[PDB]
Design a protein around this ligand. Structure first.
Ligand SMILES: *[C@@H]1O[C@H](CO)[C@@H](O[C@@H]2O[C@H](CO)[C@@H](O)[C@H](O)[C@H]2NC(C)=O)[C@H](O)[C@H]1NC(C)=O
Ligand SMILES: *[C@@H]1O[C@H](CO)[C@@H](O[C@@H]2O[C@H](CO)[C@@H](O)[C@H](O)[C@H]2NC(C)=O)[C@H](O)[C@H]1NC(C)=O
Ligand SMILES: *[C@@H]1O[C@H](CO)[C@@H](O[C@@H]2O[C@H](CO)[C@@H](O)[C@H](O)[C@H]2NC(C)=O)[C@H](O)[C@H]1NC(C)=O
Ligand SMILES: *[C@@H]1O[C@H](CO)[C@@H](O[C@@H]2O[C@H](CO)[C@@H](O)[C@H](O)[C@H]2NC(C)=O)[C@H](O)[C@H]1NC(C)=O
Ligand SMILES: CC(C)CCC[C@@H](C)[C@H]1CC[C@H]2[C@@H]3CC=C4C[C@@H](O)CC[C@]4(C)[C@H]3CC[C@]12C
Ligand SMILES: CC(C)CCC[C@@H](C)[C@H]1CC[C@H]2[C@@H]3CC=C4C[C@@H](O)CC[C@]4(C)[C@H]3CC[C@]12C
Ligand SMILES: CC(C)CCC[C@@H](C)[C@H]1CC[C@H]2[C@@H]3CC=C4C[C@@H](O)CC[C@]4(C)[C@H]3CC[C@]12C
Ligand SMILES: CC(C)CCC[C@@H](C)[C@H]1CC[C@H]2[C@@H]3CC=C4C[C@@H](O)CC[C@]4(C)[C@H]3CC[C@]12C
Ligand SMILES: CC(C)CCC[C@@H](C)[C@H]1CC[C@H]2[C@@H]3CC=C4C[C@@H](O)CC[C@]4(C)[C@H]3CC[C@]12C
Ligand SMILES: CC(C)CCC[C@@H](C)[C@H]1CC[C@H]2[C@@H]3CC=C4C[C@@H](O)CC[C@]4(C)[C@H]3CC[C@]12C
Ligand SMILES: CC(C)CCC[C@@H](C)[C@H]1CC[C@H]2[C@@H]3CC=C4C[C@@H](O)CC[C@]4(C)[C@H]3CC[C@]12C
Ligand SMILES: CC(C)CCC[C@@H](C)[C@H]1CC[C@H]2[C@@H]3CC=C4C[C@@H](O)CC[C@]4(C)[C@H]3CC[C@]12C
Ligand SMILES: O=C(O)[C@@H]1Cc2c([nH]c3ccccc23)CN1
Ligand SMILES: O=C(O)[C@@H]1Cc2c([nH]c3ccccc23)CN1
Ligand SMILES: *[C@@H]1O[C@H](CO)[C@@H](O)[C@H](O)[C@H]1NC(C)=O
Ligand SMILES: *[C@@H]1O[C@H](CO)[C@@H](O)[C@H](O)[C@H]1NC(C)=O
Ligand SMILES: [Ca+2]
Ligand SMILES: [Ca+2]
Ligand SMILES: [Ca+2]
Ligand SMILES: [Ca+2]
Ligand SMILES: [Ca+2]
Ligand SMILES: [Ca+2]
Ligand SMILES: [Ca+2]
Ligand SMILES: [Ca+2]
Lengths: 781, 781
């Protein structure tokens, strides 16, 4: 394998894969000459701390007599540089003894790798030989496939819960308009696809989806940046590692794009490549996920005990020293430098999260080996309950014991893998703040995600600790469209997602009292829409009311007419013996005055709220009363020109025959017209039989015409103080009144028609009463 | 490597990876004993034909002295069983000489593999050693990444064009409501993601997205089947291979789900696992993609020459013979069996598509080796133009020459790889029909996809050759909602994609003349929507027209009044010497008759379409004329009770002053009311100054009342044939006819108000003319 390595000799050997470098020298191999090994460039102190965690765990296990007594653990650890090719060279180094036996110490298990693509490439080769591989950082769901990867286990949780938690965080702050950026690898794509599913189930619309890489060209990065600029969405879900996101962040910083809310996956939410003060105007206020911190007592002292000369087994200490103090062993360095003097991620960490995963992977392998070592002969997991010989143990036996592993931590937590080889765990939710004292980016814990909880209760966030964009205390707005107010409704914008809608006000008569209403609700039959359609109010009912001032005036005039009729009748009764009262027919005068009273009472019927019987008794009453009065006048004229009572009764009987017939066949009824005006319901009467009203008015007018003619023939005659002329005047007044109001008798419905009717009745009755009796009263004085 | 193999010795050795079996035995070991090599189970005749294509191409290259003279090509071909593990054992066999030199013949290049995941796993290891690998079937876009895969090339096109073509096919048949099923591997997921991007670009909504595998459990297959059943989408885009889709198709056949329109990716559009007659009630009428067929002359004879004993280099011939004739060497078989007698995919093919790809991969390697062999010393591709020694050639040199390869086919087509190592090519579009003679599934070509064309013109389909669901000539319906007709618009269904909309009819006064109208267009100011709301028509304009029968009657009465006035005037003029004409003032009689003519002419003004000047000259004309006539009557009464002309001129001067004043300050103007009724515009007049009309009517009525009183004081006087009584009658007629029509003078606008106005004017004028002149005419007779 590669010359630079960390090796210790032992009975049982653990392989190790760590990213001591962030990547390799990015250059296209010309193939002009023999291609030499690609060089790793940028030093990764956090990865070196992870390697030190593996070495520390192995040394701790060796020193403890409790775990694996009389057996020494060795390691062979190589640098992957986050690259598949280096990892595969190291893995070929791991499987040499198996390759010899398929077509150098034996490797019983491997710790690593970090990246999911690297782990997948390694796991193909390792599961070929059934060598167990416990990864500390690779969290792709693709590695949960136990058909493809027979010997892969994880001390890190799967990525599915992280994508679901990202969706839950988006839902918590009431966002539905977000963007997605993913690394174009086995980490980014599966996570972003799970997020897309969990967002579409939550009615969250994703504006854009882009893929990036550390090897993305200038044109591709420009395209992604310009896609971000053209978007209105300010919440961008980025599911990537640090190296894969660094070119995009650098370009966005160079363009000074601000105001975006970055939701970070665990792989970069704590990355020193991205969390730099000079990027804070772009990436400040990032909300991201972190793993559960763990404690390794004595680990920091072990880290501080590093030295090029003293660490002979660890061959990566030389470059660590050279890159720490910027020395060579560029000024020469003695080796007396102090680790505590330099600001690097090596010692200057707050929580051990992936380091604890490395520690747990080593201890899981150690506990599987201990379970092999302490196997009682008849209680084994193998054929017939047999147990493996720890002196001649094979990798598949360790894998079998790992699939059944269940051991207690140093922290008192049960570590066990499921069928998919996954270790479930909580998430912490962190926010990127700026340190006032130091100016560096500080990761403040603002919440957690409890994967052990039932759906809907897993997410907890304390928003008072969140500073949006690094400085703001107001939750930002990340919806495509503003909500549609009450009084409006949503309308579709063609070619755009459901989240993007236009606001269209409700039509007349339809109310929408809910903000963001899909459609405008219609109002019931008797209601009409509010002014702004934010509610609707009952329709106003319209008729001729008693309390109304106009109705009051009409009722006042009706009662005045009744008073005048009663006054005339009383004058006639008290002074009937006078020759003037004797000259005219006293009985017929009484009957005429009673008829006038009935006519005024019938005029009172039209006023008021219509009812079925009221509409039944308005026209018949007036018709009968007026025919009665006209008949009394007619018989008085016939006297002027016993039997008189016969004629008046005949005419009134005819009229009541019409009235009874058309009340029996088709009675008038009150109906509430809603077609005249939308806002107002006009409560009016329905005739039932129009030809019946025709017969009513025709008979009344025919008797009127007969009396008119008979009085006209003898108008000059001076009998009863020329009563014939006054009778003609009264009849002609009746005709004037009922001719005058012809246009208003129909069409103009509502209170106007009833008002015109009662006014016509009052005018006709007053004219008749005056022309008949005012001259006689004047004579009496 | 594996014992079962195809090896031939030679100077330059080609590796080979083929799926001689469809998969591996379902032996999931509990790891109780040492795990033995997993065995492959279902024989794959098409894969054996592909292997034979490789061997045949090598044999022609060896036999032909034109290509690679004096150099013999050897092969080492292993079976992958579509499995990463077997392919990696074979690839470790390929890289043994490099592994010895990194920590058995040398392999200069490898042909394979079929699956994209298998090819990816192989390519990691091969590009580690810079060994070129030319795949014949793996089409994942992930393999185009030349950072991850340094030595991978393809004789098969990429999958991006096929996903775009799937989207174009969906667009062509006007579908927006489709489902997606993908294999959960490096083939299915990238293809389905590209399809999702191209579909969302085209506003196609995807109802469901499911992932399947040959190892999918019963519960997962049940979930996918029930998701398909709950969906209304009938077009399902499936981007998978045969083995990965077989369990789902079997389950769907068991439930007998029909009516689905399967869009097939190339990997299964020609698969014998899926294209089975017993599945045709489910998968009949499938529309899928095929590669471009190629011709290999003499290949079929070579296939027919297969024999267990004769084919000593090909070790897969034994199992091919045993599976073909169901014998062993289960009855014993001599070996005299005839290949042509058995119906297998081996000989019974129609087109060579992947076989031609295998042939082209072998010839691409051969032409790269020829370019190395014929390199002129100063024109090489290596350092300083140097050339590689073909006797001591290395794999990286062959890879370098492959990246620059450009050679002519046996069919006269240029084969060259781009920077990504891709070989672009056309697609054919095929439909799954049932054979009437045989009952097997027949792949009929129904179109093509020309990737060399510009976007929008790549797809060609002849729908006449397509039988939907295998038997139907009608394009099926795959939209979420029916289109919204003209007179309707679209409305949002909450929680659902844009493709799923409700149809809501347009509001009153709004029209949508387009199907699938997003919103209802409002109509212009003078238009209103029809009952269907499919368009809107001009509003009816309403006034009192001359042509109208009622207007005709009014004009007839006006002209009759003018005729009567002219008749009276002529009688007076011709017979002025008679004592009755001399008794009344002849000059004042002429002036009064002229005033009556002016009044009738003013009554003519109200009739007709209103205009600014017409509304200016309706009321003033009547007012002035009526003041003329009233003043003439008044001075004639004053005679009854020079200066007469002075008094009439004074009154008419007051009238003309008021008219001039209110015409100068605020003239009446024609206005088009739209607030009375939505459907109808009412063209009427606007007074301008209401108090001006009040003063006008007040002055007219005041002069009228003065004349009334003066005539009442001398009503009994017998002068001029009791003319004072008739003057009182005329003035009373004026008052009553103007009182009678009071309610109609306002509110009831439109033609009704003008009609009532002209009727009032005619009634007043007729009454005045009659009461003045009819007595004198009767005396004259
Ligand atoms: C952004 O859009 C979302 C989804 O439409 C809004 O969330 C809904 O808001 C309404 C009214 O506040 C609630 O009745 C719903 O229950 C919410 N749905 C959820 C939370 O899933 C959110 O209010 C919008 N934010 C804005 C407009 O600032
Ligand atoms: C995951 O997080 C939850 C919530 O923080 C943890 O549940 C808490 O457990 C402590 C005891 O250690 C209780 O005092 C709290 O009341 C619990 N909070 C809840 C239930 O909301 C849970 O223990 C965590 N799991 C792991 C493995 O760390
Ligand atoms: C299914 O829905 C699609 C939506 O695109 C319809 O296609 C549109 O149809 C309208 C008809 O007025 C055309 O104007 C558009 O140009 C079409 N667009 C596309 C992209 O094709 C399609 O007609 C619908 N099919 C039905 C209802 O059977
Ligand atoms: C891809 O398909 C197109 C269309 O079928 C091919 O273009 C045709 O080329 C032939 C000549 O070989 C012409 O006769 C046709 O008229 C062309 N059809 C067109 C332009 O629509 C094209 O040659 C094919 N390319 C390959 C590499 O097969
Ligand atoms: C209701 C109106 C519109 C239509 C019916 C009008 C009829 C009934 C009225 C209106 C005018 C009335 C006429 C007025 C004048 C006279 C002349 C007199 O010597 C006999 C009666 C007679 C002939 C009246 C008969 C009835 C009459 C014709
Ligand atoms: C329009 C309706 C409601 C009211 C009409 C009022 C009518 C009916 C009343 C009011 C004034 C009355 C007139 C007063 C004076 C006279 C003069 C006399 O020699 C004949 C009767 C006559 C002509 C009366 C006829 C009827 C009359 C015109
Ligand atoms: C009864 C006698 C003494 C007088 C008759 C006067 C008559 C002819 C006139 C004078 C005032 C007029 C009213 C004035 C106001 C209105 C309100 C309108 O929306 C309906 C018509 C109505 C109700 C009119 C009816 C007819 C009316 C009452
Ligand atoms: C229609 C409504 C307004 C009622 C109108 C009442 C009018 C028309 C009636 C009631 C009293 C009547 C008057 C009663 C007394 C006389 C005196 C007589 O020598 C001439 C007729 C004359 C002057 C009558 C004219 C008409 C008259 C005024
Ligand atoms: C403007 C609208 C409301 C019409 C107004 C009607 C007025 C102006 C009319 C109608 C009835 C008329 C009155 C009828 C009766 C008489 C009594 C007589 O001895 C003098 C004239 C006099 C007093 C008239 C004056 C004018 C008069 C009051
Ligand atoms: C409502 C309008 C349009 C028409 C009204 C009809 C008027 C104008 C006409 C028609 C019949 C006429 C009446 C006919 C008979 C008489 C009796 C006489 O001794 C006094 C005049 C008097 C009372 C007339 C008054 C005016 C009169 C009522
Ligand atoms: C002068 C002569 C004609 C007598 C006058 C008769 C008057 C009082 C009556 C008889 C018939 C009536 C008309 C009948 C029809 C209508 C149509 C209606 O939508 C408006 C009112 C209107 C236009 C009426 C106006 C008044 C009217 C003309
Ligand atoms: C305005 C519409 C209704 C026309 C009204 C015409 C009426 C009111 C006028 C026109 C002609 C007039 C008649 C002309 C002649 C005479 C004869 C005289 O000895 C008595 C009056 C009497 C009978 C008049 C009564 C009223 C009268 C009928
Ligand atoms: O699976 C993967 O690729 C990522 C790699 C990764 C995770 N967390 C990290 C922290 C630092 C560096 C790398 C990582 C989570 N899993
Ligand atoms: O990349 C892949 O996985 C698929 C495999 C494949 C294709 N076409 C085929 C025909 C038969 C068998 C397998 C295949 C296209 N590429
Ligand atoms: C692991 O052991 C603990 C007790 O030591 C037990 O509670 C737990 O159920 C065990 N886990 C499994 C998966 O059996
Ligand atoms: C390949 O060679 C042919 C000559 O047969 C030439 O026409 C063609 O342009 C060449 N292709 C490239 C990409 O140079
Ligand atoms: Ca120990
Ligand atoms: Ca790594
Ligand atoms: Ca990082
Ligand atoms: Ca769009
Ligand atoms: Ca040759
Ligand atoms: Ca294969
Ligand atoms: Ca197949
Ligand atoms: Ca939904």
């Amino acid at each position: 394998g590669p010359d630079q390595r960390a090796q210790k000799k032992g009975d049982i050997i653990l392989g190790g894969l760590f990213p001591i470098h962030f990547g390799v020298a990015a250059k296209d191999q010309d193939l002009k000459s023999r291609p030499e090994s690609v060089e790793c460039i940028r030093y990764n102190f956090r990865g070196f701390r992870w390697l030190q965690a593996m070495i520390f765990a192995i040394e701790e296990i060796n020193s403890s007599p409790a775990l694996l007594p009389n057996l020494t653990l060795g390691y062979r650890i190589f640098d992957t540089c986050n690259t598949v090719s280096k990892a595969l060279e190291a893995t070929l180094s791991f499987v040499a003894q198996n390759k010899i036996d398929s077509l150098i110490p034996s490797t019983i298990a491997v710790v690593g790798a970090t990246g999911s693509g690297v782990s997948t490439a390694v796991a193909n080769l390792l599961g070929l030989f059934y060598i167990p591989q416990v990864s500390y950082a690779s969290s792709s769901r693709l590695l949960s496939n136990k058909n493809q990867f027979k010997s892969f286990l994880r001390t890190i949780p799967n990525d599915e819960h992280q994508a679901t938690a990202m969706a839950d965080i988006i839902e918590y702050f009431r966002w539905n308009w977000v963007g997605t950026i993913a690394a174009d690898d086995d980490y980014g794509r599966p996570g972003i696809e799970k997020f897309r599913e969990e967002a579409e189930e939550r009615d969250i619309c994703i504006d854009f989806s882009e893929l990036i890489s550390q090897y993305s060209d200038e044109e591709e990065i420009q395209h992604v940046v310009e896609v971000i600029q053209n978007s209105t969405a300010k919440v961008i879900v980025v599911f990537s590692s640090g190296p894969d996101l660094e070119p995009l962040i650098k370009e966005i910083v160079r363009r000074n794009i601000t105001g975006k809310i970055w939701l970070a996956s665990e792989a970069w939410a704590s990355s020193s490549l991205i969390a730099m003060p000079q990027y804070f105007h772009v990436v400040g206020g990032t909300i991201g996920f972190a793993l559960k911190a763990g404690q390794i007592p004595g680990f920091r002292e072990f880290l501080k005990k590093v030295h090029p000369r003293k660490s002979v087994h660890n061959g990566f200490a030389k470059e660590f020293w050279e890159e720490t103090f910027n020395c060579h062993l560029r000024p020469l360095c003695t080796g007396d430098e102090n680790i505590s003097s330099v600001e690097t991620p090596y010692i200057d960490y707050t929580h051990l999260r992936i380091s604890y995963n490395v520690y747990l992977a080593v201890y899981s392998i150690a506990h599987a080996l201990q379970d092999i070592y302490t196997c009682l002969p008849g209680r084994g997991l193998f054929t017939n309950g047999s147990c493996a010989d720890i002196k001649k143990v094979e990798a598949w036996q360790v894998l079998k014991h790992l699939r059944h592993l269940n051991f207690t931590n140093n922290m008192g937590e049960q570590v066990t893998f499921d069928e998919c080889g996954d270790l479930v765990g909580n998430y912490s939710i962190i926010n990127w703040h700026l340190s006032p004292e130091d100016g560096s980016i500080v990761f403040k814990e603002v919440g957690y995600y409890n994967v052990y909880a039932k759906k809907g209760e897993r997410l907890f966030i304390n928003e008072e600790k969140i500073l949006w964009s690094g400085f703001s205390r107001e939750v930002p707005f990340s919806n495509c469209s503003r909500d549609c107010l009450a009084g409006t409704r949503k309308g579709i914008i063609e070619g755009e997602p459901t989240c993007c809608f236009e606001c269209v006000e409700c039509p007349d008569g339809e109310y929408s009292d809910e903000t963001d209403a899909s459609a405008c609700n219609k109002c019931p039959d008797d209601f009409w829409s509010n002014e702004n359609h934010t509610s609707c109010i009952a329709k106003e009912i319209e008729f001729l009311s008693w309390t109304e001032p106009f109705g009051i005036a009409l009722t006042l005039f009706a009662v005045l007419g009744i008073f005048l009729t009663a006054f005339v009748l009383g004058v006639f009764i008290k002074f009937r013996n006078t020759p003037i009262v004797k000259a005219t027919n006293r009985e017929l005068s009484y009957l005429l005055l009673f008829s006038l009273l009935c006519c005024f009472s019938s005029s009172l019927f039209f006023i008021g709220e219509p009812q079925d019987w009221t509409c039944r008794l308005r026209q018949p009453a007036f018709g009968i009363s007026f025919v009665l009065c006209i008949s009394c006048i007619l018989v008085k004229t016939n006297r002027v020109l016993n039997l008189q009572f016969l004629l008046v009764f005949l005419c009134t009987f005819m009229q009541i025959v019409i009235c009874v017939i058309w009340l029996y066949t088709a009675p008038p009824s009150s109906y509430r017209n809603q077609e005249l005006e939308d806002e107002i319901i006009f409560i009016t009467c329905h005739e039932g039989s129009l030809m019946a009203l025709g017969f009513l008015i025709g008979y009344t007018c025919l008797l009127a015409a007969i009396c008119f003619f008979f009085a006209f023939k003898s108008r000059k005659l001076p009998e009863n103080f020329n009563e014939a002329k006054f009778i003609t005047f009264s009849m002609l007044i009746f005709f004037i009144v009922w001719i005058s109001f012809i246009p208003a008798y129909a069409s103009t419905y509502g209170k106007f028609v009833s008002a015109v009717e009662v006014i016509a009745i009052l005018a006709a009755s007053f004219g008749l009463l005056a022309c008949i009796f005012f001259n006689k009263i004047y004579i009496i004085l």
